[PDB]
Every structure is written in C-alpha cells, then in structure tokens.
Amino acid sequence: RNYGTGRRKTSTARVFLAKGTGSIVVNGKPLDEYFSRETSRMVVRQPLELLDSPTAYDLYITVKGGGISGQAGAIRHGITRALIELDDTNKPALKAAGFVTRDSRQVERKKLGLRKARKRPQFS
Amino acid sequence: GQKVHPIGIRLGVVKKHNANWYASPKQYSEYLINDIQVREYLRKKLDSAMISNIMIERPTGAAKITIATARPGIVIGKKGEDIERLQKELTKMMGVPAQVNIEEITSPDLDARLVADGIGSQLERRVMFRRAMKRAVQNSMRSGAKGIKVELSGRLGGAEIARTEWYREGRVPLHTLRADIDYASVRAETTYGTIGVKVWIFRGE
Amino acid sequence: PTKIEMRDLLQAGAHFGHQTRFWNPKMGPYIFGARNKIHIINLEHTVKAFNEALNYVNGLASKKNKVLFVGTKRAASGIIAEQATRAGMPYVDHRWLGGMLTNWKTLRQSINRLKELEKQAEDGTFAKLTKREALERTRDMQKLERSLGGIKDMGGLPDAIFVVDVDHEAIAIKEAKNLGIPVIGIVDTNSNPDNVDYIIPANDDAIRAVSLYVTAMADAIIAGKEYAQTQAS
RNA sequence: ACAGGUGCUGCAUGGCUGUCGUCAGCUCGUGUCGUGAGAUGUUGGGUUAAGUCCCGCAACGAGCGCAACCCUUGUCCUUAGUUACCAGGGAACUCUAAGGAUACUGCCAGUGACAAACUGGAGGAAGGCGGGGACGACGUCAAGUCAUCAUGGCCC
Numbered sequence: 001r002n003y004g005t006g007r008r009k010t011s012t013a014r015v016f017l018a019k020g021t022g023s024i025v026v027n028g029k030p031l032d033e034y035f036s037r038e039t040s041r042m043v044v045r046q047p048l049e050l051l052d053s054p055t056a057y058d059l060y061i062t063v064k065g066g067g068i069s070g071q072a073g074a075i076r077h078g079i080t081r082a083l084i085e086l087d088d089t090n091k092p093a094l095k096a097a098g099f100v101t102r103d104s105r106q107v108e109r110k111k112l113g114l115r116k117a118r119k120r121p122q123f124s
Numbered sequence: 125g126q127k128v129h130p131i132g133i134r135l136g137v138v139k140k141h142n143a144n145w146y147a148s149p150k151q152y153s154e155y156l157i158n159d160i161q162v163r164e165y166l167r168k169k170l171d172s173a174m175i176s177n178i179m180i181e182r183p184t185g186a187a188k189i190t191i192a193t194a195r196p197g198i199v200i201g202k203k204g205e206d207i208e209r210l211q212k213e214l215t216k217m218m219g220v221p222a223q224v225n226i227e228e229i230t231s232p233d234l235d236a237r238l239v240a241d242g243i244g245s246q247l248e249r250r251v252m253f254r255r256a257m258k259r260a261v262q263n264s265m266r267s268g269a270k271g272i273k274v275e276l277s278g279r280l281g282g283a284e285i286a287r288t289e290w291y292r293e294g295r296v297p298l299h300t301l302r303a304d305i306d307y308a309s310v311r312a313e314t315t316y317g318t319i320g321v322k323v324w325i326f327r328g329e
Numbered sequence: 330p331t332k333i334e335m336r337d338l339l340q341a342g343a344h345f346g347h348q349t350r351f352w353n354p355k356m357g358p359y360i361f362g363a364r365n366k367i368h369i370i371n372l373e374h375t376v377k378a379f380n381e382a383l384n385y386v387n388g389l390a391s392k393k394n395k396v397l398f399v400g401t402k403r404a405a406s407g408i409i410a411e412q413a414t415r416a417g418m419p420y421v422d423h424r425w426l427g428g429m430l431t432n433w434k435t436l437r438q439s440i441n442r443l444k445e446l447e448k449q450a451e452d453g454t455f456a457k458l459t460k461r462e463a464l465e466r467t468r469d470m471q472k473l474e475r476s477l478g479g480i481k482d483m484g485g486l487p488d489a490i491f492v493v494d495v496d497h498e499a500i501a502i503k504e505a506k507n508l509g510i511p512v513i514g515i516v517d518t519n520s521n522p523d524n525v526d527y528i529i530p531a532n533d534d535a536i537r538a539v540s541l542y543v544t545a546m547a548d549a550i551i552a553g554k555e556y557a558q559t560q561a562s
Numbered sequence: 563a564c565a566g567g568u569g570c571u572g573c574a575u576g577g578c579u580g581u582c583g584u585c586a587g588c589u590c591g592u593g594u595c596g597u598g599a600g601a602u603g604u605u606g607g608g609u610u611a612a613g614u615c616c617c618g619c620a621a622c623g624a625g626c627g628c629a630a631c632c633c634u635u636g637u638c639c640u641u642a643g644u645u646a647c648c649a650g651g652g653a654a655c656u657c658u659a660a661g662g663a664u665a666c667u668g669c670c671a672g673u674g675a676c677a678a679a680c681u682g683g684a685g686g687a688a689g690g691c692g693g694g695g696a697c698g699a700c701g702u703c704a705a706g707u708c709a710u711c712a713u714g715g716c717c718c
Binding site: 314 | 573574575576577578579580581624625626627628629630631632633696697698699704712713714715
C-alpha cells in the first residue's frame with residue numbers, strides 16, 4: 001500500500017498503489033469513465049507503461065481541485081511518488097522521463113494597467 | 125514624485141502599526157474615523173510639547189493611547205494636573221473613559237518628527253534655510269546615528285522660483301527593507317508660502 | 330659593515346647598464362663608457378655613493394628612525410619583502426598605491442580595516458559566518474594585505490625612502506618630493522637622477538645585483554639598531 | 563469681528579503622481595594633474611541582468627542606485643486537527659496556517675590571466691536571477707494636480 005502525493009497547477013492527487021491486476025479507480029469510478037480526455041488517460045497511465053508494468057499494480061486515486069488535464073498531471077506525479085516507494089531503481093528511469101519533477105507552472109497573476117498577466121491595452 | 129513612504133513599505137518587515145485594534149467591518153469605519161479625530165486634536169492641543177509617535181491601541185471598550193514626547197513635564201504638569209484635564213476631554217469625543225500614558229524619549233534628536241519640527245519652527249522664525257538644514261544634520265550625527273537626509277522644498281529664502289535643497293550625511297539606504305529608518309514630512313507656513321521639510325534618520329539595520 | 334667593496338659589485342654585475350639609446354643625458358657624468366652598445370657605470374662613483382648611503386641609514390637606525398623600502402619590479406619583488414622583515418622596517422613590494430604618502434590620511438582606514446580583519450581572525454569569528462561568507466571576508470583580507478603588507482605597522486610618514494629602479498617607481502619619487510622626505514634611490518643609466526637626495530648609480534635589473542644592494546642596506550640598518558641598544562645600561 | 567467661495571494663478575507653493583526607466587547609472591571626501599573651466603577616481607582587459615565581480619591602473623575610499631533583506635508560488639519537516647479530511651471512530655493522508663529545512667556555482671569535467679567568470683554533468687521538487695510581485699538613484703519634462711487636502715498672493 002505505497003502512497004504518493006501528486007500535485008499540478010491547482011489539483012492535488014493522492015494515489016494508493018498496491019500489487020494487483022492493473023485496475024485503476026479514480027474517485028471511486030473507472031479511469032475511462034472519469035477521464036473523457038484521451039490525452040488525460042494517456043498521461044495518467046504513462047509512468048506505468050514507461051517501465052513495462054501496466055498490468056501489475058492496482059491503483060486507487062482520489063483527485064481534488066484543478067482541471068481535467070491538471071488532474072491528469074497530478075495523478076502522474078502521484079503515481080511516480082508511489083512507484084518510487086517500492087523500488088529505488090525505477091527512480092533513474094522516471095527522472096529521465098521527467099515525471100519526478102513537480103511542475104511549478106501556475107497562472108501568472110493579472111497586473112494593474114495590464115489586461116491579463118502580460119497583455120497590454122494597445123496604444124496608437 | 126516617485127518614492128514610496130519609507131514607513132509604509134516597512135510596516136510588516138521591521139516596523140509596527142501605531143494602531144492595534146480589531147473592529148468588525150461595520151464598526152471598523154467609525155473606530156478609524158474616531159481614531160483619526162484623536163490625532164488631529166492631539167496634534168493641535170499639544171503642539172507646544174514636542175510629540176513624535178502617538179500609538180492608539182484600544183482594548184474592548186477602553187483606549188490606551190501612548191504618546192511619546194520629549195517634554196513629559198509640560199504635558200503632565202504639576203502632579204498630573206494637565207494630563208487629567210486632557211483625560212476628561214479625550215473621553216468626551218470618544219467612548220468610555222480612555223487612559224492616556226506618556227513614553228519618554230531618551231534622545232530627542234534621532235526622531236525624524238522631532239528634527240523636522242525643529243527645522244519647521246526655525247523656518248517660521250525667519251532663519252536662513254541653509255543654517256537650519258545644516259545644524260539639524262550636525263545635531264543628529266553628534267547625537268548618535270548612522271545617517272541623516274534632510275530635504276527642504278519650497279520658496280527657500282523667499283525666492284519666486286521654488287527649488288529642492290537636500291543635505292545627506294551617512295548611509296540612509298532607503299531600498300533596504302531591514303533599515304529602521306525614521307521618516308517625517310512636516311511643513312513651514314512662512315510669509316512667502318509653505319516650505320516642505322522631509323527628514324530621514326537611519327539608525328542601524 | 331658600512332663600506333661596501335668594489336669587487337663584489339663587479340661580481341654581481343652592478344656595472345651593466347642599458348642600451349646606448351635609452352640613457353638619460355643627466356646620467357652622463359658617472360658613465361665609464363659604452364662597450365658593445367651598452368653603457369658601463371663607473372664603479373668608483375657607485376662605491377662612494379654607497380658609503381655615503383650606508384652612513385645615512387646607520388645614523389637613522391641609531392635614532393629609532395623608520396626607512397621605507399620600495400621596490401615592485403620582478404627583480405626586486407621578493408627581495409624587498411625578506412630584507413625588510415630582517416630589518417623590521419616597512420616595505421612595498423606588490424604595487425605603490427597612488428597616494429601612499431601624500432594621501433596617507435585616507436589609507437589609515439584601509440590599514441585599520443586590515444588590522445580589524447586580523448584581530449577577528451585570531452580569536453576566531455568564522456563560527457558565526459557561513460561557508461562562502463567567511464571565504465569572502467578571507468579573500469578580502471589577503472587582497473587588502475597583499476597591497477598593504479609592510480606599511481601596516483608604519484604609523485605615520487617615514488623620514489627616508491629607499492627605492493630601486495627610480496624610473497619604475499617614479500610615482501614614489503614625485504610623492505616624496507611633494508612631502509620633502511629624503512629618498513635614497515638606485516638609478517640605472519636610463520632613469521631621471523633628480524629629486525633623489527642620496528643617489529646610487531647601479532644596475533637595477535640583475536637579480537643578484539638587486540639583492541646585493543637591498544641586503545647591504547639591510548645589514549647597515551640592522552647594525553645601527555645594535556649600536557642603539559648599547560645605551561640601555 | 564467674521565464665516566463661506568469646486569472663484570483665479572500647478573508659471574508663486576507644499577503634499578501626492580506620471581515619465582525617461584527597474585535604464586545602470588549619478589555623485590562626493592581626500593590625494594594628484596591643470597592658470598583655468600575641469601580631469602582622475604567612474605578609464606583599460608575580461609565578465610555580468612547590473613558602476614555585478616575580478617585583475618590592471620594616481621589614485622585611495624565612500625554614498626545613493628544594482629543585488630540581498632519583504633510578499634507569493636514551487637518540494638519537505640515540525641505544532642495543531644474543527645465547521646477541514648476519510649487510509650485502516652481514526653490523527654494516516656489532502657487541506658488549513660504559523661515556525662522552519664533546502665539552493666550555496668556546494669560537487670565533477672572542461673575552457674579562462676594560476677582570476678572573475680563561462681560551458682556542460684550528477685544529485686535534488688527546484689541550478690545558476692527557479693517563476694511572479696513590491697521596492698523606482700541624481701535628475702528631466704516650469705509634465706499633472708489650487709477640483710481630495712493644505713497653502714502665498716489676487717478677487718467676491
């Protein structure tokens with residue numbers, strides 16, 4: 001029952017990895033039902049298939065906050081944090097894939113005088 | 125004009141508000157309006173004495189105003205005769221009786237307001253601005269300090285074209301947040317117009 | 330040890346000058362000749378100039394006077410350092426800062442800063458400092474000491490200055506004339522011999538010759554120190 | 563007596579603001595050079611986001627600027643667990659919000675004046691200023707504001 005905490009721009013994902021058949025349940029619902037995005041599905045299942053063990057561990061993910069692709073990144077980061085628990089020899093491969101780094105990217109705040117984070121009110 | 129107030133930009137890092145009361149948003153406004161009214165009155169009725177910092181923390185009901193003057197003897201008077209008549213007056217325009225205590229200024233030369241008021245008084249009394257500005261620099265450095273900057277703006281010398289003259293001695297690093305800089309901007313209502321007096325007193329990081 | 334002989338000067342090569350093109354016409358009197366297009370210094374005038382010179386520092390060493398050793402050329406970089414500490418006298422070997430003497434009032438702080446960094450490094454004040462920050466203070470001390478190594482214990486202006494290769498140390502000569510403190514210098518046959526009270530015509534480029542001059546000054550100033558201690562009892 | 567005046571003058575002013583421009587500059591003390599205005603420092607070799615840093619150098623130092631101290635985000639630890647949470651009532655986790663840890667060109671390989679620095683590599687959540695903000699030097703524009711306010715003069 002290895003535990004990993006996944007985080008992305010505004011979504012926090014908690015994963016409970018355990019050896020099993022390979023079923024993935026997110027928020028008490030199947031991954032395919034929860035994620036209508038094929039991109040999000042692939043991002044969630046990417047670390048498992050990266051090291052050649054998709055159908056080896058049973059997942060129980062509980063996501064909160066963020067959006068539909070931020071949650072996918074949070075789940076991927078949490079799954080990485082959980083895989084590094086059972087074995088420390090996978091950490092090199094996951095780091096080389098770039099899944100161990102938590103993306104610090106965030107919505108840059110709107111600035112006064114500006115129309116957005118950077119957009120300016122055109123002059124002439 | 126492009127310089128932030130050096131007291132407000134330091135309000136959280138190395139300074140403290142001269143107000144320490146919590147009020148509800150409904151009640152916040154009337155406290156502050158009442159709080160500001162105390163400051164204007166106390167700055168005129170107590171003008172003879174040299175007062176620099178007036179901290180107004182009001183506990184539940186009461187209000188513990190803490191003035192920091194350099195002449196407690198004339199604020200207090202004979203056996204506190206003058207402080208008591210002020211006690212019954214501040215309460216009249218405030219809520220329940222509020223106690224007033226006086227803090228002592230060991231060195232009345234490191235406070236920007238006290239230095240600025242002296243320069244403001246001298247300009248009122250037909251004193252050449254060059255000597256008034258230079259002397260206050262000398263007194264502050266000789267009184268123990270690490271930097272003084274005093275700036276006089278207006279019709280200096282009664283001229284028709286105003287100009288800014290400032291004499292800095294020391295460090296006074298305004299861009300350092302942990303600087304402990306005392307700032308004051310007072311005025312001098314001369315016969316030829318208002319003269320602005322700004323004083324910076326750097327007293328160690 | 331007040332009279333240097335003529336023989337060792339010839340052995341150390343104190344007669345070889347410079348090319349017959351770079352010479353100063355004011356250097357003319359005491360030049361023996363010009364062989365193979367090189368000016369030869371007349372040693373008779375050199376040895377007489379030393380004898381007056383070593384007789385000058387001897388009187389100063391008997392009066393607890395302080396003479397400054399100046400030399401920053403490669404041939405006189407290190408030798409000034411060891412001979413000065415043998416004599417317990419100030420020296421400058423890295424570079425003569427512009428204003429070491431005329432602007433001596435300003436250099437007080439730099440020496441005072443250097444002394445402060447030494448006192449805090451004796452008891453040990455690096456515990457309160459970080460790994461990099463201590464090295465930052467350490468690197469400042471070595472740089473501040475490299476320039477001011479001999480004059481840190483000078484405490485006021487010297488009353489005599491010993492310069493080698495007067496042409497090289499022209500700034501020191503101009504400062505000395507400004508302040509009036511006598512200078513005992515070594516002039517090659519290309520340099521300006523003026524503003525130098527005790528002239529020493531000699532070769533200032535040979536490693537052996539330079540050491541011979543500075544050491545001969547060192548034993549002389551040491552000898553006067555010994556004679557000064559004969560009046561204690 | 564007066565009060566009152568959003569009546570005039572921002573080209574009589576204070577206070578506040580824009581702007582060049584978050585550009586990397588702007589000066590001073592002493593010393594030295596010049597009859598002098600002035601110069602040097604502040605230039606030159608590199609280097610940097612930076613007058614940043616090192617080395618040279620009649621300069622030696624300093625001040626305001628740059629950087630840092632501040633806020634927020636990025637990982638982890640500690641105290642705490644309701645009105646927050648839910649792995650097995652629980653005190654795990656997420657979250658919440660106070661105090662801290664880490665990051666320092668610290669380590670490696672090279673170039674580089676035996677330098678500052680630069681180029682890549684490991685570890686780590688983060689690598690070289692990690693991302694964003696606040697902070698706006700001396701001064702410039704007789705810039706804007708007498709209608710936030712105060713204020714000299716003029717006027718009702």
